[PDB]
Amino acid sequence: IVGGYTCQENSVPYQVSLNSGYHFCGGSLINDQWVVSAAHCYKSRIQVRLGEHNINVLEGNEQFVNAAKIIKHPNFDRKTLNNDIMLIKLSSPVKLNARVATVALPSSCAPAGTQCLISGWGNTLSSGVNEPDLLQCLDAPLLPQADCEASYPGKITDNMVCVGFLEGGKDSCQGDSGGPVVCNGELQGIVSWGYGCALPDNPGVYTKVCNYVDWIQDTIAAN
Amino acid sequence: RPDFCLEPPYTGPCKARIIRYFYNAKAGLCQTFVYGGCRAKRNNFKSAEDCMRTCG
Numbered sequence: 476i477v478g479g480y481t482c483q484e485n486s487v488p489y490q491v492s493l494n495s496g497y498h499f500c501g502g503s504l505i506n507d508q509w510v511v512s513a514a515h516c517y518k519s520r521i522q523v524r525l526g527e528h529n530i531n532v533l534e535g536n537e538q539f540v541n542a543a544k545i546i547k548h549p550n551f552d553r554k555t556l557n558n559d560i561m562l563i564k565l566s567s568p569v570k571l572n573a574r575v576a577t578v579a580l581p582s583s584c585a586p587a588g589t590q591c592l593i594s595g596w597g598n599t600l601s602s603g604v605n606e607p608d609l610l611q612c613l614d615a616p617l618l619p620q621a622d623c624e625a626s627y628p629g630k631i632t633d634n635m636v637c638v639g640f641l642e643g644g645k646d647s648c649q650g651d652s653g654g655p656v657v658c659n660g661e662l663q664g665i666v667s668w669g670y671g672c673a674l675p676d677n678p679g680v681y682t683k684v685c686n687y688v689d690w691i692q693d694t695i696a697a698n
Numbered sequence: 699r700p701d702f703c704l705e706p707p708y709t710g711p712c713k714a715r716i717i718r719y720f721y722n723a724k725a726g727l728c729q730t731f732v733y734g735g736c737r738a739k740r741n742n743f744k745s746a747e748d749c750m751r752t753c754g
């Protein structure tokens with residue numbers, strides 16, 4: 476997260492870190508046994524870390540759980556990034572509490588202009604590299620689809636949504652993928668891609684979660 | 699040596715944080731960099747050994 480601020484300790488209880496030796500992606504807990512993330516975050520072996528704030532220090536509220544099932548959307552395209560969403564079933568249910576909670580799936584697609592909250596442990600610099608210890612937060616609006624398309628000519632599908640600022644300055648970055656974009660208590664986006672970070676005319680592009688609620692529920696109930 | 703070995707490391711548009719190896723011609727060695735998770739270029743290896751064998 477570039478241009479954000481440190482989140483209040485455990486103020487984003489649904490945020491999780493995907494670890495395979497080191498933190499490589501984020502995710503969101505949607506229920507005591509399932510996490511949603513980005514498909515390009517796929518790895519054969521994944522450990523999910525919940526209740527985190529300082530990713531480099533054992534604080535005592537953390538829960539480490541291994542993924543038992545990793546299911547990417549069947550129509551995911553590694554080239555165009557269309558349908559960049561993936562479900563992870565935990566080895567065992569987590570203990571839900573103040574530091575570890577679920578986030579609600581969308582009731583419908585949020586309109587452009589809706590203010591949202593993005594979070595993650597990704598790079599905080601547009602130029603250079605600075606990996607934060609503490610979870611970073613960013614308040615940003617959903618952008619009109621026409622502006623998203625004008626910024627990324629011929630690369631945006633109906634399954635994507637731009638969130639951020641066309642003037643740049645604030646954006647998600649490497650290390651934030653799979654992370655949540657929450658608007659009004661509902662998970663509306665998943666950090667996916669963009670050209671650089673916090674660059675003018677190139678706001679972050681996110682997976683439009685409201686298009687997959689049924690697929691998510693059908694997959695959960697079937698596995 | 700192959701031309702892609704002289705190109706700078708390509709992070710790509712995706713926002714994951716995956717450590718990969720790339721041949722640094724200016725230093726004459728393979729080093730690590732952060733790959734975004736998609737649309738990798740050829741100067742991108744999963745190991746230093748494979749990197750040195752291909753771009754050495």
Ligand SMILES: [Ca+2]
Pocket residue numbers: 527528529530531532533534535537
């Ligand atoms: Ca910790």
